Design a binder for this molecule. Sequence first.
Ligand SMILES: COc1nc(N)nc2c1C(=O)N([C@H]1[C@@H](O)CCCCC1(F)F)C2
Ligand SMILES: COc1nc(N)nc2c1C(=O)N([C@H]1[C@@H](O)CCCCC1(F)F)C2
Ligand SMILES: N[C@@H](CCCC[NH3+])C(=O)O
Ligand SMILES: N[C@@H](CCCC[NH3+])C(=O)O
Lengths: 462, 462
Amino acid sequence: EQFRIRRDKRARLLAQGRDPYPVAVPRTHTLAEVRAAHPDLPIDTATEDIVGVAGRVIFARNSGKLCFATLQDGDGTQLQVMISLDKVGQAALDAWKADVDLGDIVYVHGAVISSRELSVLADCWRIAAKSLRPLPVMSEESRVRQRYVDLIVRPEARAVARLRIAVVRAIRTALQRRGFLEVETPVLQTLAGGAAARPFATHSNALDIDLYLRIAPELFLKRCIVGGFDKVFELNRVFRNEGADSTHSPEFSMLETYQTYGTYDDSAVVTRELIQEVADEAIGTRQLPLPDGSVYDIDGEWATIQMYPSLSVALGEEITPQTTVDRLRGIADSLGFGHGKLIEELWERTVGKSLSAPTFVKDFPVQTTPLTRQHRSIPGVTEKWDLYLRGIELATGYSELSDPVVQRERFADQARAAVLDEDFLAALEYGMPPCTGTGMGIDRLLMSLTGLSIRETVLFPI
Amino acid sequence: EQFRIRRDKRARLLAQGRDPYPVAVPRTHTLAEVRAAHPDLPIDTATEDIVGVAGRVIFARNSGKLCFATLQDGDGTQLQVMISLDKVGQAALDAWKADVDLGDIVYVHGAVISSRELSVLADCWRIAAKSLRPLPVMSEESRVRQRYVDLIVRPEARAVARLRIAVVRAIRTALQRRGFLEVETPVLQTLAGGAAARPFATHSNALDIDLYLRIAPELFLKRCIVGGFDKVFELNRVFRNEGADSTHSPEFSMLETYQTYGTYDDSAVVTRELIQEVADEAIGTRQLPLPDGSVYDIDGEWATIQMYPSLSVALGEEITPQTTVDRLRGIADSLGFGHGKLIEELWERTVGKSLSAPTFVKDFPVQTTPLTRQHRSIPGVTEKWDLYLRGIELATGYSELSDPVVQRERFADQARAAVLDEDFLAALEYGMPPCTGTGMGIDRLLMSLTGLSIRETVLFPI
Ligand SMILES: COc1nc(N)nc2c1C(=O)N([C@H]1[C@@H](O)CCCCC1(F)F)C2
Ligand SMILES: COc1nc(N)nc2c1C(=O)N([C@H]1[C@@H](O)CCCCC1(F)F)C2
Ligand SMILES: N[C@@H](CCCC[NH3+])C(=O)O
Ligand SMILES: N[C@@H](CCCC[NH3+])C(=O)O
């Protein structure tokens, strides 16, 4: 019902030649600027520094000859205003009382004082916007269907939104210090490749074909290495037409990075530094506090373990690239398609779940890693690592497969479970120098650093 | 046929326990690093600075006891190598001659000398990648179907790719200096809005509905202002399921920016500075040279003209918001749906086409601008500008419409040519402070600054 009273203050303001939504207002400082300015003001004393400020009224204490409001800026910073009879306007005070609700954006010019809390004592005042919905005094999934309200009433939502923006800045800073170049590769592709996922298709009207949103930029980033890029990345959305869960969404921000003439050994060291540098820039500590109330140390060096050896110790027997699927299925049952899949799953179900300190696992089954180079010395495994931080599958890197005839086979196997990415394979046969790629999910980065769910990390999900 | 000889050098290299695609090679410096190091070396003299370098062989001059190649790095920098009998390997020289083609990535360790041009005289040498396609010695649309080849053989394609990356860096730098925060808003939306375009739809499997790729981020960026963001932008892809032409593609990179408590007057000044700052950072001059051989001055202040007045002078009669469509159609015929559309078109066909210096046109027909605030003083027009640079429709800005009941109407009109964006309108009725948005196309920015077509500006189009 308050929806109607509010619409009728707008109307009776328009009729009266009052502007409820004025083009401009001369806001001289932010309330943060007015705070940093008067940090220690002897309380109940006045100062002749004049300011125009605008804020959202989020409390009002109306009292005859004197109204007090709390004006909150968009960052949450608060200044109190004092709409007084005596300064200017009995009619201003009546206008104030009658026209000004809660959730109203409001400009006030005048003197900066501290009362018997930092306030502005009004020379003038005007409305900048008239709200036709009162602020509520909120469930998770209603907070997320209405982030704009969440950001006004919930300081934490402000803190989280700024945090992600700061993490993303810190990332670009870290990669740019190291000579990486940020490139833009296609989101619409004739076939989507470079990961294991079911793509979003769309019809094009220009071309009268179906196109596919990128599952991953890897294949196009590898054409940039062929093309002569030394050090490239791309920090931008990927689209995977699968289910949502606590570490999975169909649209999410993902970093990929390629460095020429380094291996997975080299890109492990960079991923650690990059994460540690981000924590410092954006959180101020490598001793990460959690909603637990616990503290997760990500400082220092990080453990590396091999999948097969670590799996062997966990199962009490030698598991090699040679170990048959009949053997592996057997073990699987004893707990509760093919070899590559079984190793990773058995590993995930035994070693994976027990991890707590930040660990790299490396040397992976050749079957489940079609784009990564065969290991230099160990037959049957690829030079790939997964990074687990606070138990989250955070990041991965490869020594990259630059052999086209091998790469052709890897795909010819995939498919038989038969059109390949012939222009990608074309690019490799022009010669791709030896290089190491990485990938990392921005949402998993935040979750691993904060505790925050994926539906708190993204501004506008669904 | 050379496709077959090459595949058979790979095979007879694998059989021989030679690695044609080795995991690693110990590249100590880039050829650029080796150049900056020995800038003035008394020619035909040797120096005992040892380096490992890797490059692509893009010339070979094989000559009995001594082979010369030009090794080109990926940035185009060149060093010459001298594979000699006498330094190490008669068998190395035979291996060189027999195994090493053109378009082959190649590592060589040894001494840095200048011959009778800066070269490395080989202690060792190894292949890093074996190319199974010779470099061609290329049409526009074959250069663009194969950018990876273009980047190797065409220096200009290198220069253009780096230029775009530098423009994009310069933009983020400029907006961040000014306190703007970069946000990520959804690409997949339940309905796409904030511009005039036909969207790409896609089916979701999670939700079993159609979703739509964003035509523009405006509606979501306005929820961030409601939400308390002072100064926001977003530099990221938009998707418009329309035709391609010389200033139009269905996927393109687009900047949008919102500033609270400024108008279109304010965002005109920022757009000029932003463009001028970009030119300086990324081009080194505001006196922009073109393929013409001409020079386009973008320095100094820029002309502002009003649409209706400028149109009037061009047509020889008073054209106002009042001027009927019958009158406008009449004029249209005399040269060769509704009022708003007719003003902009007549303007575009007379005043628009005659512009050369960088000009802002402002005060627009209310009909063709549903999201921009009605002008403060002039009835019938909206506070909007278009910026024309070297005759390209580069950028636009609005004093933003924060009135929900007006905004509801603007849409209720649109539709009747009836489901609206009710959550967007919901956000406005919580109150959006007065603000000014802008938008600019990155491809048009480059085209306007360089002369370059849209199909040279984007790394991987189609
Ligand atoms: C919500 O985020 C995701 N959503 C989906 N649906 N799928 C993935 C993520 C994610 O973060 N992924 C990682 C993961 O594979 C760790 C190593 C590689 C980097 C990554 F981004 F792909 C996969
Ligand atoms: C290849 O780029 C584009 N492609 C399409 N299909 N549509 C537009 C562009 C572009 O650059 N556009 C500008 C233009 O409207 C100038 C003022 C606003 C900014 C913009 F990016 F929308 C529209
Ligand atoms: N394309 C990979 C990330 C890069 C891996 C290294 N080349 C993925 O989506 O998992
Ligand atoms: N959404 C606009 C750009 C922003 C205009 C200012 N609010 C467009 O695509 O043209």
